[model samples]
Target chain A: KYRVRKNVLHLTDTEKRDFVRTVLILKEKGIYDRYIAWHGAAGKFHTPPGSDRNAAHMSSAFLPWHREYLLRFERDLQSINPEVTLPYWEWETDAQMQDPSQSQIWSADFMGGNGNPIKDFIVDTGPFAAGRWTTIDEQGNPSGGLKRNFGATKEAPTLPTRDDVLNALKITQYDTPPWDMTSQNSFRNQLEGFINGPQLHNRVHRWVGGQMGVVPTAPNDPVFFLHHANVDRIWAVWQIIHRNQNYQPMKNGPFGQNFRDPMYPWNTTPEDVMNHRKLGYVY
Target chain B: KYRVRKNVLHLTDTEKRDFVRTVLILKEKGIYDRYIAWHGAAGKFHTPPGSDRNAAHMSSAFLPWHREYLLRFERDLQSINPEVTLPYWEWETDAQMQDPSQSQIWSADFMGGNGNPIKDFIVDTGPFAAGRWTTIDEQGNPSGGLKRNFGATKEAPTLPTRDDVLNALKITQYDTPPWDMTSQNSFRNQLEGFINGPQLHNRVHRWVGGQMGVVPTAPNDPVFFLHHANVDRIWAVWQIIHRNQNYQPMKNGPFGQNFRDPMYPWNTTPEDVMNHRKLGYVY
Candidate 1:
């Protein structure tokens, strides 16, 4: 792989600074918002319509859609700063911390601390501090400021554990029939954190709260990309372990859920990104 | 221009059949849904977030965005049938008819007739009839079938008059400051039909009702392209008349609304499609 995505913990302070600077430059250049809108578009684009399956989530294509999404984002970041590579937020490992909130990833020098309650859960620390960074709502309207209330939800008070990640990797099938949130033993559904109902990836979103808790506004938080990088890493690991297994619903699935189907809001197909190394990236 | 987009009324039976057949092929190949999803994505992507100025509508970039949209669409159509070009629905001329519903555009052999009142306003006739075509809602979910109710809305009980079209063309400025639905003496706004709310282009949408009536789902009806082709033609004429006058708010406008700024869901800018002839198409 030409570009290696390392764990967030592994990134040097300079690497962190470069990545942050690149993202800020992207935001200033108006390129960052495109990614936000793209993610939101895919969320609304139901694969077969009326079904729970969307172009991005609650479907078999979820992993690949986001893989393509991150790849595109990484390319944009690389364009801004050629040295910058996307780093994964290993929430599963962070789950072991006595105070996950004390994560170095949320330091003032990095993604900044959590939201301030007195300021209505508005993030008031770090580079993306309230006034420094703006956010948009699900309607694509300005929501004024970045908000994050970590561990606010009772359903996801803690991040997914290392065991959870390991268990998801154990899933043999990439996806199953009726490929959706309901699919049992599906790696896609399990890693998506829907198999046990918001146990892993989805739990990370809920644990982060605010913009991260929702589908459309998740990308507003820079960590959204980092979080997804870990998800992508796990998927990559699973792919290596189960070399024989292929993307599910290569056919007979919904319009956009199939392996060959182009994800909505984009022409990039799952097959296009089935091999991470071919995309010139590795975890 | 290599391609000549003609008035819908002038298209012969064979030409109409070929255009319709090409569209059905695009639909069958799942390529047609991309257009619908793109249109919806742009509509939700507000230029500066919450300014009533989306990437596609209620903004200075509207004309350019749709021009680019139509261009790509026409390219796709040409891929299906090289002879096929996007046709303009001259609704203003149809408005002159005693019963515009009787126009050949609504004939079973063409864009299809009005929605059936007995079937909850589902379009049950012609090519894109209920059983023949599928529709997606604003959320990108299946809407079951195509629906239309001609002259259904009291606000737009009839098509925009030719006089209205002439009046819109009379506006010299491409677009005014604070470019949006409220913009005055702005050709972009007037032609977009937001001057008095649902006048020309907007009125055509409402006059057709059903999916055509809404911004997100409008492309579900093939006539949406035809309608936009007319809008694009009017803008082209205005550009011709005001040769020296350029796209307004070039630098100070919102992110995606600026002249050189890439429209959301697309990299094509207003400057790219400023010359339709240069794009190899003429109305």
Candidate 2:
């Protein structure tokens, strides 16, 4: 409902302060509740169940879901502050070596909880490698032995530095056919190769220190937005550079298009997502 | 190289004149050549062999390409016209139908043999529907038919009306999974089905004449952009509304994550495209 009068790139200092202030006001007004409701109902706000719930798995869903969530948030923000627009921080470009995992943001109930809230997986602290670290094997399988030391005597590891984030942002080039497409399933495999294959998962587990009651994590950890902001920025950049035609394919019929599956959380279909004219305004 | 300080959406009389004059001047100076070179090299500029060509293909390439390309073009335009900035046309939203195939912008050489270049396999009346039509039988193999007239005569059919264009844009609604998450090959099949399907493409042929001439054919038609702009518009709308995750089965090994495929020509890699952070802008 809100319209951006100028590019987010053109925001002045006063505007930025005003924008941030408005966000705080919006939060206070409980506008974020609508966003949370949509996300929760989408069933993707929380991690998926079982072995399927890993970094790669989570990462795959992360970009699209957050994009939708933010759009909704921005829309809500716009309804209240029509002249103001959402300004995204290019976190990857500006991150410092701060301990993101230790931030209050990650621990907040808003994040839904630390570690595997739905499962018995414990958060740990040993694994702190930043920027595109891998923790799984080929074929979407997980590896073991990586350890985290959430309760270790040392302070928790810092979030990735901007340089590290930038390195992670670099596109991994490949020579194979299907693998070359950024949307290819195989490209994830290449990421696994680059991240040293599956062993990183254990480290992720250790970073959360096994479970709750160990440490009170805050939700304001700047790392949450910083990491996710980079994630959002990348998708925007990709769309610009590549004239990607968005829409999931159909599975069967004369067209052989896929039929909609009700198991998924999304209420809308790919066809609905194909046209921006009817829906109007992203963020 | 020029940047239009004035928003195309809200141009004043002088700005509108300036924009049009600038477009004419750029065309005279062959400013689009660089854009042609870039897309041609990238293989995104689809110019069917033996078909009449026009500024439309060049312009489509120009619109998106120069948006990025002008970051490079800026210095040159600035050197020539210091007061000028590149003006953009949000042609996607413009109500007028400006099909490239029929635009008078082309020279005889570009238009091929003048009179009517496109030979439609189906009925044709309008210049836009005279090209070859691809049809799929029950088995799914595609068959081509040539329509010769520009669909100008009463006997010749007319091109699809605006409603037809809208309906074509609606196909995204039916797309489902397995197909949703299927490979590009599958996606391509689904697209072909709609294009070749009896309900759509054939109706288009019937509206024009049996076969239309050159410059009146499908892609060459000015309606192509209107059609595609709507298609592209739909995509933009879909992204905002659906906001589903980048798709699942995250581990990159079996499912590739590399984003550098030449064929998959978006700005970011699959990984970057997967995340929006890498992207800084939107359509």
Candidate 3:
């Protein structure tokens, strides 16, 4: 059976309710911090780097590695409510609005509103606002509730356009070495946004701001899943277009850190995880 | 004479040098860090929230308040370099690139490359990387140079586009009550990105990542100046369309904290800072 991830906005009202319900289960179970660690983990090797290579980010490890990360995150969520799966957010839909705070998705019934207007950047309203969550920061300072400044600024003069996405798809190769943020003409670089082409995944982090803006702690916001699900969806779509291509730096870098090396902890390499349906989830 | 804030990318190499030189002078004189403190100040009341509002974040003050912040910052820059001025990056130009990392801005001659491929997100490649900066984080810990992940991800399919800016210009009111991040249809809210419209301002932060995404420490990046210059340009443009409109929370929220209240430490309120030209500058 093909495991499918649906869009939260498109979910049936019942599905939306279940999505929220199960997501809450994971939060209570404390499953989010690990994802954050993967992005901004402490120590030299735990982060996204070009020289050492491959904890994901700025490298070819960016795409496939995150696919695996989000997949694990999804599997964890599904464990809570078997009928549930993580969802994706186009974000552009919300961008089209006059003010996204007024969007229904932000109401308490959904993810929650902007950070509080007072001292703390706490989310006072919405389902995930202050007091409703328990999370730990990069330094291990434990805190309650996911906080957000929502749209980190007053005017976002730019948001991704249809052209940006189409252009990103046009990139033919996967990632090249240095394999870091500097790689160019590589699909992974473009999509991961390290090459700064289409504004695919990273833009969501910006629009959400607050904890989401912080690399090591972004997953604290439940929306991180939906954003990545969409990111994951794009890769699957790209794979069909260039399925013949293989991950770069296949064997050049260190074992367990190269494209062909086992992602360790996961026992999978970029090669193994390139195909999503093979992992049991298809967008 | 009207001092115009021009687009940073549009400047000639000579003009860029003047701007960069002046910025460095401020940083060395320790003046720039003071404004950085205004944004990334330590402790609670120093943050953006409901009861106490001077923190300059997550509130109605999020926009024009920053106007004062950047305006003074500009004045200081001009004083040092004489003919020098802070330039703006429309950010769209880079957003449209095949890979922004490949842009001239990232050259060591300019802003330099992404964060070090090591544990430190400290930018190791750019003119501002690590050792060159003297910025203090929100907690008052001091640091050097600027830090940036450059393009936050390879798969961030969506980035802020020009259309998002046009959408923000269409908004009517400057801001509404509860003027923090949740205001609806408020141009201030949309521009601040608090209301989450097109993600004009917040998008840049994520696009730049590193210290820029966090409000308190964003000014630490030189690009933060150019980026805010563009955001400032948009605010000016929006004001033209809604010149007759007024900022919300017109009065009576918190003493010395309302729209008309005098902002301490600066001697100007949101009302006084509304017109950029009055301060001897125009975009």
Cα TM-score of candidate 2? 0.29
DockQ of predictions, in order shown:
0.71, 0.01, 0.01
User: What ranking of all candidate models by lDDT puts the best one first?
Assistant: 1, 3, 2
State the fraction of real interface contacts model 1 keeps.
0.88
Best by TM-score: 1
The TM-score values for the models, in the order shown, are: 0.92, 0.29, 0.48
Tens-digit lDDT track of model 2 for B1-283: 1233333445554544443344335323433222322222222212111112111221112122222333334344554566544433232233244542343222221112213343323424322222422322111122243233333455323444445444444443323322222323222123222334322223333333322222223322222222333233333343444466232223321111212311111232233333222232233
lDDT of 3 by residue, A183-276 (tens): 7888877877655532656666766778777666787787777778888888788888887877787776544447675452344678788778
- Runs with alpha carbons beyond 4 Å of true place in candidate 2: A1-11, A37-60, A96-158, A161-229, A244-266, A269-283, B1-283
Candidate 1: tens digits of C-alpha lDDT, residues B184-258: 889988888888887898899999999999888999999999999999998899988889999987897889899
Could you give candidate 1's per-residue lDDT for residues A102-217 as a string of tens digits? 99999999999999999999999999988998888898888888999999998999999999999888999999989988999899999998876778999999999989999999
Error of 3 at B236 (Å): 0.3
Residue B159 error for model 3, in Å? 3.5
Give the candidate order by descending TM-score: 1, 3, 2
lDDT values for all models: 0.90, 0.31, 0.66
Better of 1 and 3 by TM-score: 1
Q: Where does model 3 exceed 4 Å of error?
A: A1-283, B42-54, B153-158, B196-198
Full-model lDDT, candidate 1: 0.90
True contacts kept of 2: 0.00
